[model samples]
Target chain A: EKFKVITTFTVIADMAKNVAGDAAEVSSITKPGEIHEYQPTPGDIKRAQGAQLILANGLNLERWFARFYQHLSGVPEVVVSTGVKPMGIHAWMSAENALIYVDNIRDALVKYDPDNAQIYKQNAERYKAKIRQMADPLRAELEKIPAD
Target chain B: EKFKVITTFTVIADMAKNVAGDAAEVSSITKPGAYQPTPGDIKRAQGAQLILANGLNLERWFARFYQHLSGVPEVVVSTGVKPMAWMSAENALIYVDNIRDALVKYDPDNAQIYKQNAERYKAKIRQMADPLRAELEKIPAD
Candidate 1:
């Protein structure tokens, strides 16, 4: 059976999906832009309770996670933003920061489920390549657009 | 005397300085962008309550210093962080967070102070990206 991974929000959930590929099932407790001051529903708890791992952003971004984590036992949580030097409120908006997020996700999945380590590694590299491709063109286009 | 803190090198030393502020006296085992402990380095690190090291094999050379400075607790400031080459400002934030976390853990009485300083420092660091991006965008594409 695939490992069950629960992320704090949609952004992280999307990143996890790319890194997990088919090796893990990914879900999110919060919807897009619904994270701050978020109060988890009973359904969110029910889903998270059975997760193999819980991935979060830390930096106290998910203040509600403290109570949310109290109900679950034995599930390890990885702060995917572990090494993200947070730039602005939305760190993942930059393709460079997204690369860090994906790397952390890849590490977490491999650590928790080593049986599928190879798949996670391969998928993460492929995904990172896609992310890198976005950086150049965006920079090139921004050069012509006035900062004002 | 304030809380005594020893760091492996300047990168961690700089982060420690921001977090420690006037609360702790921060020192390094080696010069900036450098390592390898000397006899005086070991002597200087003595009597410290906390020794901050950047893990991920950054402090492997400090193995000998551990022998001389036995009693002081060693805190790997990179504890929860996944290291990325900190060439970018965005990557440096992770290192700063870990430094702040370590100071708070070792000096809980000054936790509020460290927390405030860390937030301010992070904000200062975060704020740099905008002007930088604006400048880069000024270059002609054609």
Candidate 2:
């Protein structure tokens, strides 16, 4: 049985999907253009109640998420941004930061479902190596662009 | 002589007004909650010849903003905060970039006028930086 994961919005949802990778049914509360203002919808609650893990951007980025958490009655909620070394609060900025995000997601998944530990660990190691390879070329390309 | 600064929405208009410190007429085309592309806004464009906008399609964000608000107003945009998304300032550099590029383009003709607006806008963004960062930082992680 795959775990069900509900994420707050785009960046976290995207990261969670990568870590879960067929291991979970991942969804998000806020879609694009929907804005993230501390308001959660009925769909968000439904997903949370059934969710094995809930991933959020944290950093006060998702205003209404605390209320969402309150409604959840003790389900597991993981902060994708927590404990990871702070990079730009926005995950999209650097490849290195994204690498941290990927690891966080994988760790959470394995933590919640120990049965899939080997698969999760394998995925984490594979993704981290890819992230490391991406770091330099990505940074080099970023350097080429003159600052505005 | 008051500097004339044209803008897109209330947010940027508010920023420009504060920075200009009563030295300029900060006018905008779209009012809050008004759709972006409606025919009504097109007519409003006539009043603002020098326009400022949050580029990366704020006009697109609001359907009312995209009616292409006619009139070839000398356009200036604010792309502040290089966002990495498809539709935000983060993906596009910050408003200063827009102001600087607009100055160069609108310069020699509106050189001094553009420079004054740029400096004022920069200071305002600097002031805004701390608060905005704080706002994002305050979100509690789940």
Candidate 3:
């Protein structure tokens, strides 16, 4: 059976999907743009209860998560931004920030289930390289635009 | 005068520097592998209006200095990121996100510049993910 992982938001859920591959089941508590004011439904709590791990974006982004987490027992919650140097309010929304979230998810997955660490690491590396590739083109394109 | 921002290490310093550009002066407390803070670091932190740190118990010693820094705000740049066993380019983006926010907060007068810089950098990050996904698709399912 695949490991069950519940993330706080869609971006995190997507990152988890890449790292977990087919090794784990991943879902999100909130859709994109809903993270800031996410209202948990009963179903969301139920999902959290059943999840083996709960991944979240810390820095008070998910203001409601603390109270929501109280309902679950023994299910370890991993803050995907664990090693990230955080920014205040709405900082987690950027794509550059997504890389940190992805790496954190990869690490947490490895720690939780070392058996699949190799796969997670490989997936993370490939994804990171892709992120790097976008840099030059993005800059070049942005340069074309006038900064008003 | 430029805003003086202090970070825990080189990595954070780099991210902060990128976002801050010419708007702020950024420095790190410890060199790579010098996780433990020194008296000199604490002294250096005193001059900063904001201190950026990597959470996840990586800087266990930072807590003690917090009280001494007093009014200065300590922003955890990794606050929204999850704990990972390794580092990658994805991790770099998160740092950039955090740095962008911290700079904006520390110096709101330059918020527009920070936002513009962040948006441009973030777009690049998103673009990078696309081709990577295509490459992964090419790999046979294990």
Candidate 4:
């Protein structure tokens, strides 16, 4: 079985899982609607404690994450939205922001699971390119809108 | 209540929620993961007075939803933001501005409620904008 990687919510979890591929099992503590205002239950704390590494958005977006994180101490943590555009919740909504989001996730996974660095790096490259491709058409469409 | 506003996903739904507050009910079709639209998902969405989408081809599957659905406003939330390969926090700020503008246009009487919540939400995005640069630096040089 792959090691467990848990994130604060589903969006970051999905991005992390993309980088992980077969190397690790990824999940999140909160569901989609729950991210903005979650109060961790006992089940969530237990789930978070067992993680090999924890990932979060870290923009105070989690609101409850810092305190929840402290109590789950000793699990290595990476804020995937780190160094990206600092926006309130789900920075991945910006295809551009998702690139940085995935980059941070790859760095964290490669560091924590060096055995799979190449796999994570390869997946990250493909994923980022897909994001780039997704942006191009939108950029083209963006130009068509009236500036006035 | 202002009107039912639906977005294709959670991030925009949350942004819409910020602007709607008590004035309207806001929700998303997809939760957070990779979602393929359900048959009922499209039918349920047909009731919305205003719809919002990130429109960066973020919702390729979302297009299929509209074939079975029609009319009303399916507002593209990314209309005003400049797209780039390089990420910028301001892009998200621009998203908030666009969302607020849509809400005011859709629900004129709720204008103040939408505007106030957006100000606070926009401020939060700005205040949370430090300390992330270190992660980008962490990526190793090839």
Candidate 4 is scored at a TM of: 0.35
Considering lDDT, which of the candidate structures 2 and 4 is the better prediction for this target? 4
What lDDT does candidate 3 reach at residue A118? 92
Candidate 2 lDDT, B34-121, residue by residue in tens: 2233565444443332445442223222112212211111111111112231212232224444444443453345455556766766
Please provide, for model 3 over A1-148, each residue's C-alpha lDDT reduced to its tens digit, 9 standing for 90 to 100: 6777775567777878888887888876543341344354666556554456656544224333223222221222222233343222132235456676677778888877788889989998888776666554546666778878
CAPRI quality level assigned to candidate 3 from its DockQ score? incorrect
Top-down TM-score ranking: 1, 3, 4, 2
Per-residue CA lDDT of model 1 for A36-131, tens digit only, reads 343546676565544666565531122332232222211222121234322221223467667867887888788779999999999999999988
Report residue A26 deviation for candidate 1 (angstroms): 0.8
lDDT of 1 by residue, B26-126 (tens): 87755333134467865666565665543311222222222222211211111122212333566557667777777787789899989998888888878
Per-candidate interface DockQ score = 0.03, 0.01, 0.04, 0.02
**Candidate 1 CAPRI grade:** incorrect
C-alpha lDDT score of every prediction, in listed order: 0.60, 0.47, 0.57, 0.58
Indicate whether candidate 1 or candidate 2 has the larger DockQ: 1
Per-residue lDDT tens digits for candidate 2, residues A1-148, read: 6777665456767666666676677776643453434344666546545555555443112233222212221212111111111112133356655665676677667777778777777777777787677665557667778888
Candidate 4 chain A weakest lDDT stretch, 10 residues: A75-84
Worst 10 residues of 3 chain A by lDDT: A71-80
In candidate 1 chain A, where is summed lDDT lowest over 10 consecutive residues? A71-80
Please give the distance, in angstroms, between residue A40's alpha carbon in candidate 4 and its true position after superposition.
5.6
| Rank by lDDT (best first) | 1, 4, 3, 2
Chain B TM, per prediction: 0.64, 0.39, 0.57, 0.60
Clashes of each: 0, 22, 22, 1
